[PDB]
Structure 1
Amino acid sequence: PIVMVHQCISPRTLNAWVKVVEEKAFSPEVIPMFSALSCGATPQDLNTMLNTVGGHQAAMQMLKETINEEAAEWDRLHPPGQMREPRGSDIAGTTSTLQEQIGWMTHNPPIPVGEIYKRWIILGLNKIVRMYSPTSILDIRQGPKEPFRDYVDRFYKTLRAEQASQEVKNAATETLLVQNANPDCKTILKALGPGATLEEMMTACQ
């Protein structure tokens, strides 16, 4: 990473990333973990992290195709001894050296190729998280003997993995959460009506 001087990847940062994917796969928390463990990363560090992912090579190829899509858009938007202009392949670290990546990231002003690449990767990880969610939000309904908290847990766990704006996800919640509570809770919830906080809803259905 760049901390401005270049620094070696630490073994613990690398191991922390491998362990996250091993234990959580592509649960939504992989994205905050990747962003935090990739703080300051060069494109070379980013490629190291992705290359250490064990298995899940279908998702990694999907990630690659997302990167190629974003690099093509970068090239569309941005066609001796001096700083080169980075193309998409440079940002992805396929056609650029570490020395060039350091030069871009530490220049005044910088071309933050590490942050640009990280954005493309996170977009790819968002797609993977959506693709690998085992549930769809229309199928989350409160069981007749499921505590309301357990149902809300399942609801937002599913909604968390979908790829959409926060405002879009909130519309889905207003459309489905109370409506798919079980009969006894749904009537209590509708009696409270809109504007009830989730805290108030959970107290009323406990």
Structure 2
Amino acid sequence: PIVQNLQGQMVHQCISPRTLNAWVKVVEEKAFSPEVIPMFSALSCGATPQDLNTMLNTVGGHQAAMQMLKETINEEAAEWDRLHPVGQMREPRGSDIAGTTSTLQEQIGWMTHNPPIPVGEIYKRWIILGLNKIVRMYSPTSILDIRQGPKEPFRDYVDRFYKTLRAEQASQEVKNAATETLLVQNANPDCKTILKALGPGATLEEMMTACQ
């Protein structure tokens, strides 16, 4: 990645083994759980297109998802070349941002220019777009199938509810609807009677306290 040294200039630094290991382990352990994407974004802080490709190439399995990810990158690269037709500096095309037709020197050039062209940030945006598709596709359960067991604590039910809601990545209005209707409705009779006794417009804290 590109960091700031003691001379106040933005220089290139080799990606650390600790970062390399952290990214590999979180993929082997958490697969494509929703929380993997923020971890990726954090581990790839200030990363160059080369570094981003390095992290992606270090992934062992999940080659179906990696292939889908390439297609997403291809779609976004094409759109970039459409919205950007061709001592003024040469602006990057789609392949330059993806680190395919650009070198490390050229990547540093764009990122440290004034004004900068954050090829690393643009590329990462493309990648996260693809990772969002994969997470949603690999989502095991629908929000409709989340039902509180007769012996399940309310907390463990709400946990599975919002974990599912997060992975499904539905629209904002849809998430609101599921919270209002599905959450209360699909609770066991014991909790639902208590929840309805608190009236509409009750906070989640009030709901979970009453069913503790």
Length-normalised TM-score, structure 2: 0.93
Deviates more, 1:177-186 or 1:41-50: 177-186
1:81–1:103 CA distance, 2 compared to 1 (3 A): farther
Helix, strand or coil: the match of 2:60?
coil
In structure 2, the residue corresponding to 1:158 is in which secondary structure? Answer: helix
Deviation at 1:74, TM superposition (A): 0.9
C-alpha distance 140-15 of structure 1, shift in aligned 2 (>3 A): same
Question: Distance between the aligned counterparts of 2:2 and 2:186, measured in 1?
Answer: 49
After superposition, the Cα gap between the structure-2 partners of 1:203 and 1:89, relative to the gap in structure 1 and judged at 3 Å, is: same
The aligned residue for residue 161 of structure 2 is 155
How far did 1:119 drift? Answer: 0.5
Deviation at 1:182, TM superposition (A): 1.2
Output the CA distance in 2 between the equivalents of 1:157 and 1:172: 13
Question: Paired residue for 2:6?
Answer: none
Report if aligned partners of 1:127, 1:163 keep a CA contact under 8 Å in 2: no
State the Cα deviation string for residues 99-127 of structure 1 (Å, max 9, x = none).
Answer: 11110000000000000000011111111
Deviation, 1:80, is 17
1:175 equivalent in alignment to 2:181? yes
Gap change, CA 1:106 and 1:168, over 3 Å in 2: farther
Change over 3 Å in CA distance of 1:79–1:172 after alignment to 2: farther
- Structure 1 residues 104-152: Cα deviation after superposition (integer angstroms, max 9, x where no partner): 0000000000000000111111111111111111100111111111100
Matches within 5 A, 1:41-60: 41-60=47-66
Deviation readout 1:20-43 (Å, 9 max, x if unpaired): 101110111101100000000000
Structure 1 residues without counterparts, runs of 5 or longer: none
TM-score, structure 1 as length reference: 0.95
| Cα distance per residue 1:157-185 (max 9 Å; x no partner) | 10111223445423322231111111221
Identity of aligned residues (%): 100
Tell whether 2:131 aligns with 1:130: no
Give the deviation of 1:67 after TM superposition: 0.8
Post-superposition offset of 1:76: 1.3
Deviations 1:51-82 (A, max 9, x none): 00110000101111111111111111112986
Partner of 2:101: 95
Compute the displacement of 1:46 (Å).
0.2
Decide which moves more: 135-144 or 81-90. Answer: 81-90
Q: SS at 2:12's partner residue?
A: coil
Is the Cα contact below 8 Å between 1:83 and 1:103 reproduced in 2? no
Secondary structure of residue in 2 paired with 1:5: strand
Equivalent position of 1:39 in the other structure: 45
Measure the CA separation in 2 of the matches of 1:183 and 1:154: 18
Bigger mean CA offset, 98-107 vs 173-182: 173-182
Label 1:194 to 1:72 Cα distance change in 2 as closer, same or farther (>3 A).
same
